[PDB]
Amino acid sequence: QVQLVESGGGLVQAGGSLRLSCAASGFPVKTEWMEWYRQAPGKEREWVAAIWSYGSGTRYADSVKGRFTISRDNAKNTVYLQMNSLKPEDTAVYYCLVRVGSWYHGQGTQVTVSA
Amino acid sequence: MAFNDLLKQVGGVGRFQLIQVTMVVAPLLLMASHNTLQNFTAAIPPHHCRPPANANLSKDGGLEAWLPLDKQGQPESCLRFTSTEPCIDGWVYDNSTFPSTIVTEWNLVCSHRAFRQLAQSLYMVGVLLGAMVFGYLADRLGRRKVLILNYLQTAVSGTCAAYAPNYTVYCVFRLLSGMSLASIAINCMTLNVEWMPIHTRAYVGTLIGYVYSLGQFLLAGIAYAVPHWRHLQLVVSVPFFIAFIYSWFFIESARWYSSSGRLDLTLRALQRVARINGKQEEGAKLSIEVLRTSLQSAMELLRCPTLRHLFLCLSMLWFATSFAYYGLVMDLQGFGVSMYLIQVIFGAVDLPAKFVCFLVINSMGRRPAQMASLLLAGICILVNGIIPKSHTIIRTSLAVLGKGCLASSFNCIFLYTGELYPTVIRQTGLGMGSTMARVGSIVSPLVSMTAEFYPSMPLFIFGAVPVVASAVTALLPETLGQPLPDTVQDLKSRSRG
């Protein structure tokens, strides 16, 4: 199967920098939809980052454009979502998605902005 | 020394002929409207999976949690999240632009996406059948009984398709509608040609073209007036009921009566026509003895080699022309501009294109005009299909240029095929060319079915077919010298020259 173990969570000061990784196996990272979703505590699913195969297209959301960027690594078969200019409302759990039609919702990483 | 002498003797410019030819061609507006109606009656509005009622939207705070988004910024059109699972609680549509269509009533969407095109292909199968068999049935029965039957059948089928319990009823009634509509389209023109004298031949054809274009206008007018599909189909099909009601007032063509072996009916019809035309005195001299003394095949098509090649090339020409024309006409949901405006613009460009090709063929030639119409149409369709969806006004201008080119190619191919075949088999050639065009309209929706493999591939095929048709159209020679070939041997002798 396809495993999307993800790590990078922790305690980071507001406005800090973090590079969380979503390790992949069993398929190249340039073939399917490496999407991203997050659950703020008490909030519903939200769309933040998304890429398509071969990396010629990439789209963001209203609260994501111009502030966060998504990267890929074909050699490591990993997709990276760096985090800069955090706000107190950004605390969430980021979900890694294999495909738009993938039942493999990731286990998620807890990101805290603190003060 | 023929029926034509009696026709001038009876009339030719009288009130009866003009009133009958403006009264039998009026339903061609709805003929064109019914042919194209799938644009407005089966438009696809934006849609997405409906979240199950188990989840509460009050605590969700939005519908993004239960709907994946595509690259365009809209919710997914076939899929739903699990907290992924396919649409199993149906779909949700909007009513901002299209209040209702067939793809809204019977959710003809992903995993049923092909069924609307299948219904269209079944309607065109009905067209082909109701031409092929009803031509023989009209030759064996008449040209007025067949016309009234066509009016009744098209009206009944239109209403019954407007009220369809499910999709299968819709497809079957569309097949019957195609039957009747092809029969009326191919019978009204021949009845008008038979009744009217030689002077207004192809003048009736110009009138038919004008009526078709006016019907293209009228379709957009009704669509703007009535957007609901169950009401749009009813409004477009109701006047066919009054058409069947008042079409008992037609008068059978005297040529068919004479060809049936009886001249008493021909004499009665001619005296009636003289009576309504007001010149009873001149028609009084008519009698049975006067009529008698004055009124005096695919096998060989597929046997003769030169005839085989001529038929094959003309068949490909009709195939490509109808194929591309219908593929372009019945695909205007994704052209940016509103449906009604682009429809009336297509109807508008219909006329100047026909004027231009007529001027060119009467000045330059027929084969070059057909070539420059078909190749330009194919190029326009290709460059329309390769341009990204973001552009709207340039795409619409390209589409209207393409339709102008298709109409010019239609006129050119009809004229050339009329003045190309030998008089022995010319009528059979024209009929088989029309059959080829009808099966082309059959196959065009089947090609458009394959949008699932690639969204723009139907346009690619619709534009690639005419290009290869024009490329392989090589044996057909120019006919500007007006030789009017009579027999196969004369065709061979003039072929070398």
Coordinates of C-alpha atoms in Angstrom, one line a residue:
Chain A
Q1 CA 0.0 0.0 0.0
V2 CA 0.9 3.7 0.2
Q3 CA 2.1 5.0 3.5
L4 CA 2.2 8.8 4.3
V5 CA 3.9 8.9 7.7
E6 CA 4.3 12.6 8.5
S7 CA 6.4 14.4 11.1
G8 CA 7.5 17.9 12.0
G9 CA 5.0 19.0 14.7
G10 CA 6.1 20.8 17.8
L11 CA 6.1 24.1 19.6
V12 CA 7.1 27.1 17.4
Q13 CA 6.8 30.8 18.3
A14 CA 4.3 32.8 16.3
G15 CA 5.8 33.9 13.0
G16 CA 8.4 31.1 13.2
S17 CA 9.7 28.8 10.4
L18 CA 9.1 25.1 10.1
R19 CA 9.5 22.5 7.4
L20 CA 7.2 19.6 7.9
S21 CA 7.6 16.4 5.7
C22 CA 5.1 13.9 4.4
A23 CA 7.1 10.7 3.6
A24 CA 5.7 8.6 0.8
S25 CA 6.4 5.1 -0.5
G26 CA 5.2 2.7 -3.1
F27 CA 4.6 5.3 -5.8
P28 CA 6.5 8.3 -7.2
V29 CA 5.6 11.7 -5.8
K30 CA 5.2 13.1 -9.4
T31 CA 2.2 10.9 -10.3
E32 CA -0.7 11.8 -8.0
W33 CA -2.3 14.7 -6.0
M34 CA -0.3 15.5 -2.9
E35 CA -2.9 17.7 -1.3
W36 CA -3.0 19.2 2.2
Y37 CA -5.8 19.8 4.7
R38 CA -6.0 21.1 8.3
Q39 CA -8.3 20.9 11.2
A40 CA -8.2 23.9 13.6
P41 CA -9.5 22.9 17.1
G42 CA -13.3 23.2 16.8
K43 CA -13.1 24.0 13.1
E44 CA -14.0 21.9 10.0
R45 CA -11.7 20.6 7.2
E46 CA -10.0 23.4 5.3
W47 CA -8.0 23.4 2.0
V48 CA -4.6 25.0 2.2
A49 CA -2.1 23.5 -0.3
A50 CA -2.4 21.3 -3.4
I51 CA -0.1 20.1 -6.2
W52 CA -0.6 17.9 -9.3
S53 CA 1.7 15.4 -10.9
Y54 CA 5.0 16.6 -12.5
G55 CA 4.7 19.9 -10.6
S56 CA 3.7 22.1 -13.5
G57 CA 0.6 23.3 -11.6
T58 CA 0.0 24.4 -8.1
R59 CA -2.9 26.2 -6.4
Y60 CA -3.5 27.7 -2.9
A61 CA -6.4 29.1 -0.9
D62 CA -7.4 32.6 0.2
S63 CA -5.5 32.4 3.5
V64 CA -2.6 30.5 1.9
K65 CA -1.6 32.5 -1.2
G66 CA 1.7 34.4 -1.0
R67 CA 2.6 33.2 2.5
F68 CA 3.2 29.4 2.4
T69 CA 4.7 27.3 -0.3
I70 CA 4.7 23.5 -1.1
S71 CA 7.8 21.6 -2.2
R72 CA 8.5 18.2 -3.6
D73 CA 11.5 15.8 -3.6
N74 CA 11.4 13.0 -6.2
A75 CA 14.6 11.4 -5.0
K76 CA 13.4 11.2 -1.4
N77 CA 9.8 10.6 -2.6
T78 CA 8.6 13.2 0.0
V79 CA 6.5 16.3 -0.2
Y80 CA 7.4 19.3 2.0
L81 CA 5.1 22.1 3.3
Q82 CA 7.2 24.9 4.8
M83 CA 5.6 27.2 7.3
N84 CA 6.4 30.9 7.7
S85 CA 4.6 33.9 9.1
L86 CA 2.3 32.0 11.5
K87 CA -0.7 33.5 13.2
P88 CA -2.4 32.4 16.5
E89 CA -5.3 31.0 14.4
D90 CA -3.0 28.6 12.4
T91 CA -2.9 25.9 15.1
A92 CA -4.2 22.8 13.4
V93 CA -3.4 19.2 12.3
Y94 CA -2.3 19.0 8.7
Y95 CA -3.6 16.0 6.7
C96 CA -1.6 14.5 3.8
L97 CA -3.7 13.2 0.9
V98 CA -2.5 10.7 -1.6
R99 CA -5.2 11.5 -4.2
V100 CA -8.5 13.4 -4.5
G101 CA -10.0 9.8 -4.4
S102 CA -7.7 8.4 -1.7
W103 CA -9.1 6.9 1.5
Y104 CA -5.7 7.3 3.2
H105 CA -6.2 10.3 5.4
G106 CA -2.9 11.0 7.1
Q107 CA -2.4 10.6 10.8
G108 CA -1.6 14.4 11.0
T109 CA 1.0 16.5 12.8
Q110 CA 0.1 18.9 15.6
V111 CA 1.5 22.5 15.0
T112 CA 1.3 25.0 17.8
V113 CA 2.0 28.8 17.5
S114 CA 1.9 29.5 21.3
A115 CA 2.5 33.2 21.7
Chain B
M1 CA -45.1 18.8 -74.3
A2 CA -44.9 17.7 -70.7
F3 CA -46.6 18.5 -67.4
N4 CA -44.7 21.8 -67.4
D5 CA -46.8 23.1 -70.2
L6 CA -49.9 22.5 -68.1
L7 CA -48.2 24.1 -65.1
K8 CA -47.6 27.4 -67.0
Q9 CA -51.1 26.9 -68.4
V10 CA -52.5 26.5 -64.9
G11 CA -50.2 29.0 -63.3
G12 CA -46.8 29.5 -61.8
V13 CA -47.0 32.9 -60.1
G14 CA -50.5 32.5 -58.7
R15 CA -51.7 33.1 -55.1
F16 CA -52.1 29.3 -54.4
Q17 CA -48.5 28.3 -55.1
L18 CA -47.1 31.1 -53.1
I19 CA -49.4 30.6 -50.2
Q20 CA -48.8 26.8 -50.2
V21 CA -45.0 27.3 -50.2
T22 CA -45.1 29.8 -47.4
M23 CA -47.5 27.5 -45.5
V24 CA -45.7 24.2 -45.8
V25 CA -42.2 25.6 -45.0
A26 CA -43.2 27.5 -41.9
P27 CA -42.5 24.4 -39.6
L28 CA -38.9 24.3 -40.8
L29 CA -38.1 26.9 -38.1
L30 CA -39.2 24.3 -35.5
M31 CA -37.4 21.7 -37.6
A32 CA -34.1 23.5 -36.9
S33 CA -35.1 24.2 -33.3
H34 CA -35.9 20.5 -32.6
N35 CA -32.6 19.5 -34.3
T36 CA -30.5 21.7 -32.1
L37 CA -32.7 21.7 -28.9
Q38 CA -30.3 19.5 -27.0
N39 CA -28.2 22.6 -26.3
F40 CA -30.8 24.2 -24.1
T41 CA -32.9 21.2 -23.0
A42 CA -29.8 19.1 -21.9
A43 CA -27.3 21.7 -20.7
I44 CA -25.1 20.7 -17.8
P45 CA -25.1 23.0 -14.8
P46 CA -22.4 23.0 -12.2
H47 CA -22.9 20.2 -9.7
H48 CA -21.2 18.3 -6.8
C49 CA -21.8 15.4 -4.5
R50 CA -24.4 16.0 -1.8
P51 CA -23.2 15.4 1.8
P52 CA -25.1 12.7 3.6
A53 CA -27.8 13.9 6.0
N54 CA -26.1 12.0 8.9
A55 CA -23.6 14.8 9.2
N56 CA -24.9 18.1 10.6
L57 CA -24.0 21.2 8.6
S58 CA -24.7 23.5 11.6
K59 CA -21.5 22.3 13.3
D60 CA -19.7 22.0 9.9
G61 CA -19.8 25.8 9.2
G62 CA -19.5 25.1 5.5
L63 CA -19.7 22.5 2.7
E64 CA -16.0 22.3 1.9
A65 CA -15.5 19.7 4.6
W66 CA -17.7 17.2 2.6
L67 CA -16.6 18.1 -0.9
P68 CA -13.2 18.0 -2.6
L69 CA -12.3 20.9 -4.8
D70 CA -10.8 20.7 -8.4
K71 CA -8.2 22.9 -10.0
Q72 CA -10.8 25.3 -11.3
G73 CA -12.0 26.4 -7.8
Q74 CA -15.2 24.4 -7.7
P75 CA -16.4 21.4 -5.7
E76 CA -15.7 18.0 -7.3
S77 CA -18.3 17.0 -9.8
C78 CA -18.3 13.2 -9.1
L79 CA -16.7 12.5 -5.7
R80 CA -17.3 13.1 -2.0
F81 CA -15.1 12.8 1.1
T82 CA -15.7 10.1 3.7
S83 CA -15.3 12.4 6.7
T84 CA -13.3 9.3 -0.3
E85 CA -16.6 7.9 -1.5
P86 CA -18.6 8.4 -4.8
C87 CA -21.9 10.2 -5.0
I88 CA -24.3 7.8 -3.3
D89 CA -26.8 10.4 -2.1
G90 CA -27.2 12.0 -5.5
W91 CA -25.9 15.3 -6.7
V92 CA -26.7 19.0 -5.9
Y93 CA -27.2 21.5 -8.8
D94 CA -27.7 25.2 -9.0
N95 CA -30.5 27.2 -10.5
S96 CA -28.7 30.5 -11.2
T97 CA -28.6 30.0 -15.0
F98 CA -30.4 26.7 -15.9
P99 CA -33.5 26.1 -13.8
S100 CA -33.7 22.5 -15.0
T101 CA -32.4 20.2 -17.7
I102 CA -32.5 16.4 -18.4
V103 CA -29.1 16.1 -16.6
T104 CA -30.8 17.6 -13.6
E105 CA -33.9 15.5 -13.5
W106 CA -32.2 12.2 -14.2
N107 CA -28.7 13.2 -13.0
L108 CA -27.0 12.2 -16.2
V109 CA -23.6 12.9 -14.7
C110 CA -20.3 11.1 -13.9
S111 CA -20.9 7.3 -14.3
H112 CA -23.8 8.3 -16.5
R113 CA -22.0 11.1 -18.4
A114 CA -22.4 9.3 -21.8
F115 CA -26.2 8.9 -21.7
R116 CA -27.1 12.4 -22.9
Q117 CA -24.9 11.9 -26.0
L118 CA -26.4 8.4 -26.3
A119 CA -29.9 9.9 -26.4
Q120 CA -28.7 12.4 -29.1
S121 CA -27.2 9.5 -31.1
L122 CA -30.5 7.6 -30.8
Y123 CA -32.3 10.7 -32.1
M124 CA -30.0 10.8 -35.1
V125 CA -30.5 7.0 -35.6
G126 CA -34.2 7.9 -35.7
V127 CA -33.4 10.6 -38.3
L128 CA -31.5 8.1 -40.5
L129 CA -34.3 5.4 -40.2
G130 CA -37.1 7.9 -40.9
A131 CA -35.3 9.1 -44.0
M132 CA -34.3 5.7 -45.3
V133 CA -37.6 3.9 -44.9
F134 CA -40.0 6.8 -45.1
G135 CA -38.6 7.8 -48.5
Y136 CA -39.8 4.4 -49.8
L137 CA -43.0 4.6 -47.9
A138 CA -43.7 8.1 -49.5
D139 CA -42.9 6.8 -52.9
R140 CA -45.4 4.0 -52.3
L141 CA -48.1 6.1 -50.6
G142 CA -47.8 9.8 -51.3
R143 CA -46.4 13.2 -50.4
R144 CA -49.3 14.6 -48.5
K145 CA -50.4 11.7 -46.3
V146 CA -46.8 11.2 -45.5
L147 CA -46.4 14.8 -44.5
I148 CA -49.5 14.9 -42.3
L149 CA -48.3 11.7 -40.6
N150 CA -44.9 13.3 -40.1
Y151 CA -46.4 16.3 -38.5
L152 CA -48.6 14.2 -36.2
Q153 CA -45.7 11.9 -35.2
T154 CA -43.2 14.8 -34.6
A155 CA -45.8 16.6 -32.4
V156 CA -46.8 13.6 -30.4
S157 CA -43.1 12.5 -30.0
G158 CA -42.1 16.0 -28.9
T159 CA -44.8 16.2 -26.3
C160 CA -44.2 12.7 -25.0
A161 CA -40.5 13.3 -24.8
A162 CA -41.3 16.5 -22.9
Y163 CA -43.1 14.3 -20.4
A164 CA -40.8 11.4 -20.0
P165 CA -41.0 9.3 -16.8
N166 CA -37.4 8.1 -17.2
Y167 CA -34.5 8.2 -19.6
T168 CA -35.4 5.2 -21.8
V169 CA -38.7 6.8 -22.7
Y170 CA -36.8 9.9 -23.6
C171 CA -34.4 8.1 -25.9
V172 CA -37.2 6.1 -27.6
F173 CA -39.3 9.2 -28.2
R174 CA -36.3 11.1 -29.5
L175 CA -35.8 8.2 -32.0
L176 CA -39.4 8.7 -33.1
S177 CA -38.9 12.4 -33.3
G178 CA -35.9 11.9 -35.5
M179 CA -37.9 9.5 -37.7
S180 CA -40.7 12.1 -38.3
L181 CA -38.4 15.1 -38.6
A182 CA -36.1 13.5 -41.2
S183 CA -39.2 12.4 -43.2
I184 CA -40.7 15.9 -43.2
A185 CA -37.4 17.6 -44.0
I186 CA -36.9 15.4 -47.0
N187 CA -40.5 15.4 -48.1
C188 CA -41.5 19.1 -47.9
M189 CA -38.7 20.2 -50.3
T190 CA -39.6 17.6 -52.9
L191 CA -43.3 18.4 -52.7
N192 CA -42.6 22.1 -53.2
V193 CA -40.2 21.3 -56.1
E194 CA -42.7 19.1 -57.8
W195 CA -45.6 21.5 -57.5
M196 CA -43.8 24.7 -58.5
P197 CA -42.5 25.2 -62.1
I198 CA -38.9 25.3 -63.3
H199 CA -38.5 29.0 -62.8
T200 CA -38.5 28.9 -59.0
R201 CA -36.4 25.8 -58.6
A202 CA -33.6 26.5 -56.2
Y203 CA -35.5 29.7 -55.4
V204 CA -37.6 27.4 -53.2
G205 CA -34.2 26.2 -51.9
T206 CA -33.1 29.7 -51.0
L207 CA -36.4 30.2 -49.3
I208 CA -35.8 27.0 -47.3
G209 CA -32.4 28.2 -46.3
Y210 CA -33.8 31.5 -45.1
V211 CA -36.5 29.7 -43.1
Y212 CA -33.8 27.5 -41.5
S213 CA -31.8 30.6 -40.4
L214 CA -35.0 32.2 -39.1
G215 CA -35.6 29.1 -37.1
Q216 CA -32.1 29.3 -35.7
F217 CA -33.1 32.8 -34.5
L218 CA -36.4 31.5 -33.2
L219 CA -34.7 28.8 -31.1
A220 CA -32.7 31.3 -29.2
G221 CA -35.8 33.5 -28.8
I222 CA -37.7 30.7 -27.2
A223 CA -34.8 29.7 -25.1
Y224 CA -34.5 33.2 -23.7
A225 CA -38.3 33.2 -23.2
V226 CA -38.6 29.7 -21.8
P227 CA -35.5 28.1 -20.0
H228 CA -37.3 25.1 -18.4
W229 CA -36.6 22.0 -20.5
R230 CA -40.0 20.4 -19.9
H231 CA -41.6 23.7 -21.0
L232 CA -39.1 24.4 -23.7
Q233 CA -39.7 21.1 -25.5
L234 CA -43.4 21.6 -25.2
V235 CA -43.3 25.1 -26.6
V236 CA -41.1 24.0 -29.5
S237 CA -43.3 21.0 -30.3
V238 CA -46.8 22.4 -29.8
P239 CA -47.1 24.2 -33.2
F240 CA -46.4 20.9 -34.9
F241 CA -49.8 19.8 -33.5
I242 CA -51.5 22.7 -35.3
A243 CA -49.3 21.9 -38.3
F244 CA -50.8 18.4 -38.4
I245 CA -54.2 20.0 -37.8
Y246 CA -54.1 22.4 -40.8
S247 CA -51.9 20.2 -43.1
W248 CA -55.0 18.5 -44.5
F249 CA -55.3 21.6 -46.7
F250 CA -52.3 20.6 -48.7
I251 CA -52.8 19.5 -52.4
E252 CA -50.9 16.5 -53.6
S253 CA -48.2 17.0 -56.2
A254 CA -49.7 16.3 -59.7
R255 CA -46.4 14.8 -60.8
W256 CA -46.7 12.0 -58.2
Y257 CA -50.4 11.5 -59.3
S258 CA -49.3 11.1 -62.9
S259 CA -46.5 8.8 -61.9
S260 CA -49.0 6.6 -60.0
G261 CA -50.7 5.6 -63.3
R262 CA -53.9 7.7 -62.9
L263 CA -54.5 11.0 -64.5
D264 CA -58.1 11.7 -63.2
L265 CA -56.6 12.8 -59.9
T266 CA -54.0 15.0 -61.7
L267 CA -56.8 16.7 -63.7
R268 CA -58.9 17.2 -60.5
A269 CA -55.9 18.8 -58.7
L270 CA -55.0 21.0 -61.7
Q271 CA -58.6 22.3 -62.0
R272 CA -58.7 22.9 -58.2
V273 CA -55.4 24.9 -58.5
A274 CA -56.8 26.9 -61.4
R275 CA -60.0 27.5 -59.4
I276 CA -58.1 28.9 -56.4
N277 CA -55.6 30.8 -58.6
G278 CA -58.6 32.5 -60.3
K279 CA -57.9 31.4 -63.8
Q280 CA -60.6 28.8 -64.3
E281 CA -61.1 29.8 -68.0
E282 CA -57.7 28.7 -69.1
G283 CA -57.8 25.5 -67.0
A284 CA -61.3 24.6 -68.4
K285 CA -59.7 23.4 -71.7
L286 CA -57.9 20.7 -69.7
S287 CA -59.2 17.2 -70.2
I288 CA -58.2 13.5 -69.7
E289 CA -57.1 13.2 -73.4
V290 CA -55.0 16.4 -73.0
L291 CA -53.2 15.0 -70.0
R292 CA -52.5 11.7 -71.7
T293 CA -51.0 13.1 -74.9
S294 CA -48.8 15.5 -72.9
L295 CA -47.5 13.5 -70.0
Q296 CA -45.7 11.0 -72.2
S297 CA -30.2 1.7 -57.8
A298 CA -27.2 1.3 -55.5
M299 CA -26.3 -1.9 -57.3
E300 CA -24.8 -0.3 -60.3
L301 CA -23.6 2.5 -58.0
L302 CA -21.4 -0.1 -56.2
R303 CA -20.5 -2.1 -59.3
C304 CA -19.0 0.5 -61.7
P305 CA -15.4 1.3 -60.7
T306 CA -15.4 5.0 -61.5
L307 CA -18.9 5.3 -60.0
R308 CA -17.6 3.4 -57.0
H309 CA -14.8 5.9 -56.5
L310 CA -17.1 8.9 -57.1
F311 CA -19.6 7.6 -54.6
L312 CA -16.9 6.8 -52.0
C313 CA -15.4 10.3 -52.2
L314 CA -18.8 12.0 -52.2
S315 CA -19.8 9.8 -49.2
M316 CA -16.7 10.9 -47.3
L317 CA -17.5 14.6 -48.2
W318 CA -21.1 14.3 -46.8
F319 CA -19.8 12.4 -43.8
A320 CA -17.2 15.0 -42.8
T321 CA -19.4 18.0 -43.5
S322 CA -22.3 16.8 -41.4
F323 CA -20.0 15.3 -38.7
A324 CA -18.1 18.6 -38.2
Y325 CA -21.2 20.8 -38.5
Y326 CA -23.1 19.0 -35.8
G327 CA -20.1 18.6 -33.5
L328 CA -19.6 22.3 -33.7
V329 CA -23.2 23.3 -33.4
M330 CA -24.1 21.0 -30.5
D331 CA -21.1 22.1 -28.3
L332 CA -21.6 25.7 -27.1
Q333 CA -22.1 25.3 -23.3
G334 CA -18.4 25.9 -22.8
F335 CA -17.9 29.0 -25.1
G336 CA -17.9 31.7 -22.4
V337 CA -20.7 33.8 -23.8
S338 CA -24.3 33.1 -22.9
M339 CA -26.1 30.4 -24.9
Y340 CA -28.8 32.7 -26.3
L341 CA -26.4 35.3 -27.6
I342 CA -24.1 32.8 -29.3
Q343 CA -27.1 31.0 -30.7
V344 CA -28.5 34.2 -32.3
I345 CA -24.9 35.1 -33.5
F346 CA -24.7 31.6 -35.2
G347 CA -28.1 32.3 -36.8
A348 CA -26.9 35.7 -38.0
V349 CA -23.6 34.5 -39.5
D350 CA -25.6 31.8 -41.4
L351 CA -26.7 34.3 -44.0
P352 CA -23.6 36.3 -45.1
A353 CA -21.6 33.1 -45.4
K354 CA -24.2 31.7 -47.8
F355 CA -24.1 34.9 -49.8
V356 CA -20.3 34.8 -50.0
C357 CA -20.1 31.2 -51.2
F358 CA -22.9 31.8 -53.8
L359 CA -21.0 34.8 -55.1
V360 CA -17.7 32.9 -55.2
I361 CA -19.2 29.8 -57.0
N362 CA -20.9 32.1 -59.5
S363 CA -17.7 34.0 -60.0
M364 CA -14.6 31.8 -59.2
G365 CA -15.8 28.2 -59.0
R366 CA -17.4 25.4 -56.9
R367 CA -14.6 22.9 -56.1
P368 CA -12.2 25.7 -54.9
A369 CA -15.0 27.2 -52.8
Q370 CA -15.8 23.8 -51.2
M371 CA -12.1 23.2 -50.5
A372 CA -11.6 26.7 -49.0
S373 CA -14.7 26.2 -46.8
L374 CA -13.9 22.7 -45.5
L375 CA -10.2 23.3 -44.9
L376 CA -10.8 26.7 -43.2
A377 CA -13.6 25.0 -41.1
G378 CA -11.3 22.2 -39.9
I379 CA -8.5 24.7 -39.1
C380 CA -10.9 26.9 -37.2
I381 CA -12.2 23.9 -35.2
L382 CA -8.6 22.8 -34.4
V383 CA -7.5 26.2 -33.3
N384 CA -10.7 26.5 -31.3
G385 CA -10.0 23.2 -29.5
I386 CA -6.4 24.1 -28.8
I387 CA -7.1 27.5 -27.3
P388 CA -7.4 27.4 -23.5
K389 CA -10.8 27.7 -21.9
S390 CA -10.0 31.1 -20.3
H391 CA -10.4 33.0 -23.6
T392 CA -14.0 33.7 -24.5
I393 CA -14.5 36.3 -27.2
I394 CA -11.8 35.0 -29.5
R395 CA -13.2 31.4 -29.0
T396 CA -16.7 32.6 -29.9
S397 CA -15.5 34.5 -33.0
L398 CA -13.6 31.3 -34.0
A399 CA -16.8 29.2 -33.5
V400 CA -19.0 31.5 -35.6
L401 CA -16.4 31.6 -38.4
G402 CA -16.4 27.8 -38.2
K403 CA -20.2 27.6 -38.5
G404 CA -20.1 30.1 -41.4
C405 CA -17.6 27.8 -43.1
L406 CA -19.7 24.7 -42.4
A407 CA -22.8 26.4 -43.9
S408 CA -20.8 27.4 -47.0
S409 CA -19.5 23.9 -47.3
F410 CA -23.0 22.5 -47.0
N411 CA -24.3 24.7 -49.9
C412 CA -21.2 24.0 -52.0
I413 CA -21.4 20.2 -51.5
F414 CA -25.1 20.1 -52.2
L415 CA -24.7 22.1 -55.5
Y416 CA -21.7 20.1 -56.6
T417 CA -23.2 16.7 -55.9
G418 CA -26.4 17.8 -57.7
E419 CA -24.4 18.9 -60.8
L420 CA -21.8 16.1 -60.7
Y421 CA -23.6 12.7 -60.9
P422 CA -25.0 11.5 -64.3
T423 CA -28.7 12.0 -64.8
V424 CA -29.3 8.3 -64.7
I425 CA -28.3 7.9 -61.1
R426 CA -28.2 11.6 -59.9
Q427 CA -31.3 11.3 -57.6
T428 CA -29.9 8.1 -56.1
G429 CA -26.6 9.8 -55.6
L430 CA -28.2 12.8 -53.8
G431 CA -30.2 10.5 -51.6
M432 CA -27.2 8.4 -50.6
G433 CA -25.2 11.5 -49.9
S434 CA -28.0 12.7 -47.6
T435 CA -27.9 9.3 -45.9
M436 CA -24.2 9.6 -45.5
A437 CA -24.7 13.1 -43.9
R438 CA -27.4 11.6 -41.6
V439 CA -25.1 8.8 -40.4
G440 CA -22.4 11.4 -39.9
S441 CA -24.8 13.3 -37.6
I442 CA -25.3 9.8 -36.0
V443 CA -21.6 9.3 -35.3
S444 CA -20.8 12.8 -34.2
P445 CA -22.3 12.5 -30.7
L446 CA -20.7 9.0 -30.4
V447 CA -17.4 10.8 -31.0
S448 CA -18.3 13.5 -28.4
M449 CA -18.9 10.6 -26.0
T450 CA -15.1 10.3 -25.5
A451 CA -14.7 13.6 -23.6
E452 CA -13.8 11.4 -20.6
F453 CA -10.5 10.4 -22.1
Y454 CA -9.6 14.0 -22.9
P455 CA -11.9 17.1 -22.6
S456 CA -10.9 18.6 -25.9
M457 CA -10.5 15.4 -28.0
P458 CA -14.1 15.7 -29.4
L459 CA -13.1 19.0 -31.0
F460 CA -9.9 17.4 -32.2
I461 CA -11.8 14.7 -34.0
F462 CA -14.5 17.1 -35.3
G463 CA -11.8 19.2 -36.9
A464 CA -9.5 16.4 -38.0
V465 CA -12.1 14.6 -40.1
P466 CA -12.9 17.4 -42.5
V467 CA -9.1 18.0 -43.1
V468 CA -8.6 14.4 -44.1
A469 CA -11.8 14.5 -46.2
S470 CA -10.5 17.6 -48.1
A471 CA -7.1 16.0 -48.5
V472 CA -8.5 12.7 -50.0
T473 CA -11.0 14.6 -52.2
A474 CA -8.8 14.4 -55.3
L475 CA -10.7 12.5 -58.0
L476 CA -13.6 15.1 -58.1
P477 CA -13.1 17.5 -61.0
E478 CA -14.3 21.1 -61.5
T479 CA -17.7 21.5 -62.9
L480 CA -17.7 25.1 -64.0
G481 CA -18.2 24.2 -67.7
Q482 CA -21.7 23.0 -67.0
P483 CA -21.7 19.8 -69.1
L484 CA -24.6 18.1 -67.2
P485 CA -23.5 14.5 -67.8
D486 CA -26.3 12.1 -68.8
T487 CA -25.0 8.5 -68.9
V488 CA -22.0 6.7 -67.4
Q489 CA -20.3 6.4 -70.7
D490 CA -20.5 10.2 -71.2
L491 CA -19.1 10.6 -67.7
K492 CA -16.1 8.5 -68.6
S493 CA -15.5 10.3 -71.9
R494 CA -15.6 13.7 -70.2
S495 CA -13.5 12.5 -67.3
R496 CA -10.4 12.3 -69.5
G497 CA -11.0 15.7 -71.1

